[model samples]
Target: PIEITDVTGRTVTLKKPAERVVLQWSGAGGPFFTISALMGKDTPKVIAGMDTSLQDYRADMWKHFTAEMPELAKIPVVGTIGDKTFNAEQVVALNPDVIFIPVDLKDQYESDAKAKMDAAGIQTIYIDYHAEKLESHQKSIEAIGKALGKEERAAEISKFYTNRVTRVLDRVSKINKPKPTVYLEVGMNGPEEFGNSFSGNYSWGALATMAGADVITKDAIKKSSPINPEFVLEKNPDIIMIMGSYWPKKPTSMRLGFEATEDSSQALLKAFTTERQGWSDLKAVENKQVYSAHHGLPREVFDAAVFEYLAKTFYPEEFKDVDPEATLKEFYDKFLPFSYSGIWFMHMN
Candidate 1:
């Protein structure tokens, strides 16, 4: 009934839920997961998405979604993070009634895409799963839900987010362990060198904070750049987490997620540079506390489970019975079209 404001503080009105929605700038599965929570079994009947190249790069998720939503193969590829061309030609080609832009790219939407969409009489909205602020994230879930004409569903998911995050926080408060200094080697570049360790605020940085771990991704947080190996050595972290994915290059990297398994995964784990070198003299290595987590799982609305996984890893004695995978499985069971069947959080130690 009134204009609603987005994270960017821009105001817009939606008379009804958009019929044809296009996800223009989600980093990985953020928009898809949000949409899945909104639609569940009705998603295949619903439509419009990029040509998910997930099959070639992330065959596990590709297989899961494809099996659930057969129409996924038919979704068009209208944009890329590389070129980032949200030109009118692309907009008109998709003929979307509404387009969802990533909150971090709100300026990009305001600069170019907004005007084209306005001229074409199309509505645009912003969603953020990458927000540093918890309040910002809370509103995002509600906004996406409201946009989808699923306010009740949105509220439910919003509650789920609070409950999940609070569960970890509550547990963390009661546990008493010397907070371990952490070094998260984000596997985007693989293990040849250190990666973009999260420093402060959001992403994996916030997750570590919630798990009661002192993160040493300080240099990487500001610019998503790598820090000096010497800085990491100085910290001599009690826990070293290798954020793993099915990325190219760096053959020695640890692997996790759906493509990973115990045997095949262990080889990658044992090959960690942090586990090798004189780095093994570190406290973490002595205790066999080196581990790998799925890098792609964070920065999404469903990331609370990722925090749970980290908390469990950092304090196994405290969270001895907590199963983050089982927690994620429940979310998928309640809010997704397909059942959850993948190893996202693992311990190679």
Candidate 2:
């Protein structure tokens, strides 16, 4: 018998470790990556189905791993988890020993579909990395590994995550200077339309705050909404971070992803910054403290590296020896099945 607790504080008891599992999403460092990292060669045997809708964001990882392990492509499409596209019949049809759902979708599933699945003897478990908190990330990994009968691998991965996070926090705690103010926005809407910035300790906001910077939106914004462009000009943050991704449909979005070259990304980032009203005179822009980081990295398990990058950016002299890019490469080589490549974090000269 096996029993595990999820991030939502729900206790689920399994008669045995789940032999067949269905994952809700296949984004980077999401269920697909977590299971693959823990199960390794046995992933093909344990995984039963998944929602492959958002696979395009990290197409590099998707294309590479699916080509190497064709088993991934063959897995049944269970339905997109975020939207209401999750079909109960399709999930019932798979008859997976258990299913892992993101905590965000817990309420939606529990409304009615969960009853049917429970009646059908399908166990549902909730997990989350999107919480942008290390406690939740570590516990989610442990829960997934427990369900997969790979507790030791999960422990190893969690330890790696903790060590990296602790090292950065320990150093940041010793800093006695006034915290630098930071403004982070999703650079998807380009220069004309303001993209959303976080208001709480979540997403890139969590990363910046954890790195000892005061997020400008923490008190002003209530959700991931667009902040008043004028507010940014007035605050004059010490650093500005524009999060980008390979959003093919968004032609004007800041380009920073696996396929993005450094030259092009820097060009777009600088262009995006220079075009903003009253931005050139801001301390962050004037001093070349603006950065473009891959949008996908913050809400997942490997966000410790992003934390390190932010910490170093905030206090370069203190964190002079920290190399987050190398640490990211090391993380990939150690836990992930695929070799690492592509630019995930960068800064302007």
Candidate 3:
């Protein structure tokens, strides 16, 4: 009755429609959630590769899903991507008709994988939501809808995001204040030898622009690049935002790890502030404007949430009506099946 095209450009006609969908990647969760909400059915069975650490921010949401759909909790896990601990055998045994994967990864590894899966009679849908721009994200939503045979609902979600983003832009544009130069640090607490990193032309940069802040790493790096402390000092950002996961002191889950605590954020800010003091007298440290945001979910899922937070943080006067916490709560209530009670923000002294 319905025709769905796989990434290999092959058409697969569905007798009815895909009822049991498996997401092979965590990034696919956003599109799946959007569709599930529209369908008004119990959340589709999800075999998530990302561990609980990745879903920590929306703890209540996942708990709700598990409770609402006991089958979800019982679904067998097939494999993981990053850690490379996937069970190809288990995945094949699941006999999933459709599998959702990231477009970027598909671009790199899909050709061979697609061939293999096709031979096995499984259809792969490559969706790209982490594109460098807003339009691309909108396209991603529509594309997911097309793949899932829910174009109308996908359009509605896309339009909602577009309107929300537009509203943020309009409200932010009225602020005549100077754009604050900002640096985003990722994986600071990790054992990697790298001292600091920056956000490129991706989500973080987009967020900076939305907040009317100048992203220092735009031209310096691509997606995410590691930089020396000296480079940051050279730019002397007016504000420093550390992207981290839930840490005890900060106790916030940004989907990266449990190590990203308030103490971690504060330590990171102090390190940057102290590191750059000898090189350049940065305004961010002097003003004590160091802050941190969760690095858990993709921007597609939290774009509106991030926008509200940024608008409120950057131009409080203009965004007086924006309530980020409430917005996040609403998102959880509608899309997620549970109550949201957690700290997402913390100031580093």
Candidate 4:
């Protein structure tokens, strides 16, 4: 028996190493990516079932990897976490040795899905790569590694992740540069409709704060909500970041991902700036500091690259020589299964 403690502080006893596993979420930051990464080229042999939303949410990412490993598409679809489509029957039918879920879904999983899996004699464990803290990121990686029987690989990933993130934090702390005021928003709804901005140290907001930027939304909203346009104009942040992803349904969303090219992302950002009311005169727009990046970058275990990008964006002069793209590519080359070739982060200009 292998005993491992999860991010939720629950000690789950797996009969043995998790050879057959079901992952709850299929998003970039979900267990699917973490497991694939830690297990490396052997991912095809382990993952038995997973949520199929990645095809719908991040089609570019799904297509990129599935092309390399065709078996990814063949994995059974268990259900999506957020949509409440978790099919206990399908998950049970798969007969996975264990199931992995994000900490965010603990409440819903316990209230609804836990009993079903328990009765089926399938153990479920929670691992979190979504939190902003480095400690949580390190702990989550180690826990997953233990469950997968890939302790060595997990340690390497954790070291790489921690070093990169620490380098960014250390540089920012010593720079003594005046912090820039930043506003970040999800551009999923496009310029026509206001999109949500996260607060209370979550997602984009958390990354910005970690990079030493004065996040404008930190005090305005509680969790995630749309900020008033008038409030944005009033604050006039020094940096404006509109989060982007491969959302096929949102035709007008800021396009930044595997399929996005520099020219395409810049054009979409230009549209957001020119079309939005009073956005033309904002400091960030005026200075050409308005930027966009993949929305999924922050939630993944390899988010160290995202941290480096945020640090440089917030303090360009201090980190002019640091190559965030190279950092990201190196991570992929060393750990991930596929080649890196995406416009994950870029500015309007």
Candidate 5:
């Protein structure tokens, strides 16, 4: 019998190492990346399901690793973090020894999923790579590592995260540079139409805050809220960063991530400066400090590069020598099963 405490402070007893694991989050979710990273050549063989929306949306990332782990392509979608619901019958069909969910989803888990799954007897494990504070994320990593019987691998990853984060924090520690006010958006069609933009307290928003920017989101809206164009002009942020990815439903939502190019990147960037409200007059737009990156890039465990990028973007004079792209590639060289060669982050003309 093996017992481990999860992020939500629940003690789950597993008869053995989880044989058939049902990861509730999709392929883009942290669990899939974390498990595949730490486990290396011996990645958990009994992967019953995963949310594969990213596989289709960001096919570039999938193509690199799927060649290495053919099983990944075969894994089906359970319930992705953001959309849809999958019932207990679908979960039970996998004959899973354990089911994994993000720690942030505890309420939903307990409200209904727990009661239904309990009758069928499947353990739930919670993992958190994106906590509000750094300490919380660290502890969650350590806890999940112990549960997976990969304590050593987990430690290495934790150390990698710590080193990357610490270096960025340390570089800016003694500098008396004033923090720049920053604006980040979820990028639904680049201000042509508004769809779920964040201030700076949630997901990638918190990431911007971590990089030492005085995020306007603290007052722009509570966490992931809509922005009023008038409020933004009044604030006049120093930097504008729009999170972008493929949204076929939203053809103009700042296309980014694998398979992105300057050709289309410039085209979409043009939209934000013109279509959006008061953006052309804003300081950030005027100064050419506007930028875009893959929305998924910052919200995951491998987000140290994001910290490095933002720190330099805000205080370019201070960190002119720091190479964030090389740093990102180094992380892949050391940890990932395969090499990556797709465009993830970009600067728009």
Candidate 6:
């Protein structure tokens, strides 16, 4: 038996502590994956991940995981994410001792879901990693760790994440070059959409600043807010990095499935080239430095990988010796039970 205090200042005691856990959201999956890796466990029997309605995409994480542990595929999936088909009833039937749900879930959804679980006598806890703050992310690691009886492992993983981020900051601190302006795009073109979506202090923006690039979208966008094309033209950043839920492939299928549109890539490219061509006078586009990144369920899980890529992109000379592929491989080896293979980054002609 052990006692741990969670981030919410609640003392939870685990007697014969939780061995079976269900993760209902992808945002909390990163910390869960980190803890699972440290504990030598496989597939804590996921009940659900990002709801299908929310664009459930866990291929990258599973790819990295199964690459390390081949048998992970054998794990049973109890349900999917989406509307009526999602079936929260099935999740309750699984009888998970602890159900991990995101704190950001709609209050009504959370309440109804918790009520059902409570009727079944299952313990439910909420942790939000996307609280738009670094401390919240760190606390999430601790909360998830305590829940799974792997507090020490969670602390270790947290320290590793913190240390690596600090190292990047240290490297940037020693650089004497002028801060390059960068644009981080999150979605394809729509009449109401364009520009960097996440705020300056958000994940992508935070990574940009840490890599010595001045994030132009910092002041203009809110976390997950759509920005207008005219605003991007006005800013004319030196570098543009597109973050799409699917990359290295056409997004027609995903776009049509989710956004009721198709071939948004052309619209996106044209929006930047035509609307912001004058702004393209900046170093990034003038030098053809636009890059695309995959935005998926595992997006935040491999942020360290994304940071390395961005570092190389924004400060080529500084990151000349850093191999992002190898770094990603190392992360896969250490944290996942699998190997990662695929084309994650792509550049335009």
Please report, in order, the local distance difference test score of every candidate based on alpha carbons. 0.71, 0.81, 0.58, 0.84, 0.71, 0.57
lDDT value for candidate 2? Answer: 0.81
Candidate topping TM-score: 4
Tens digits of per-residue lDDT for model 5 on 173-208?
A: 766768899887878655676655565677776767
- In candidate 5 the C-alpha lDDT for residue 93 amounts to 77
Cα lDDT for residue 320, candidate 3: 76
Candidate 2 per-residue lDDT, tens place, 263-346, comes to: 878887887777888887999988899987788776676777887888998889988888888887887788777667777787
Task: Write the residue-wise lDDT of candidate 4 on 18-81 in tens digits.
Answer: 9888876666556777787787788878888867767777788889999998888887777865
Q: Report the candidate with higher lDDT, 2 versus 3.
A: 2
- Report the candidate with higher TM-score, 3 versus 6: 3
What ranking emerges by TM-score with the best candidate at the front?
4, 2, 1, 5, 3, 6
Candidate 6 has which clashing residue pairs, if any? Answer: 51-81, 52-81, 65-338, 67-338, 67-339, 68-337, 68-338, 68-339, 69-337, 245-295
Candidate 5 colliding pairs: 26-51
* Residue 288, candidate 3: alpha-carbon lDDT: 74
Task: Using TM-score as the measure, name the better of candidate 1 and candidate 3.
Answer: 1
Listed in order, each prediction's TM-score against the native is: 0.87, 0.93, 0.74, 0.94, 0.86, 0.72
TM-score for candidate 2: 0.93
TM-score head-to-head 5 vs 6, winner: 5
In the range 1-349, model 6's lDDT, one tens digit per residue, is 7565544555655564565565554433434554455556534443323222212454445445555656545543444333455566787666667665555553645645667767877765555555433465567677777766667877776775665555566788898988888877765542233534667777677667777888887877776576665666677777777665432244321121122223454354434544443644655667787766555422244455566677778788888777665665666577654444554554544
Ranking by lDDT: 4, 2, 5, 1, 3, 6
Task: Tell me the spans in candidate 2 whose CA falls farther than 4 Å from its real position.
Answer: 28-30, 56-60
Q: TM-score of predicted model 1? A: 0.87
lDDT of 1 at 47: 48
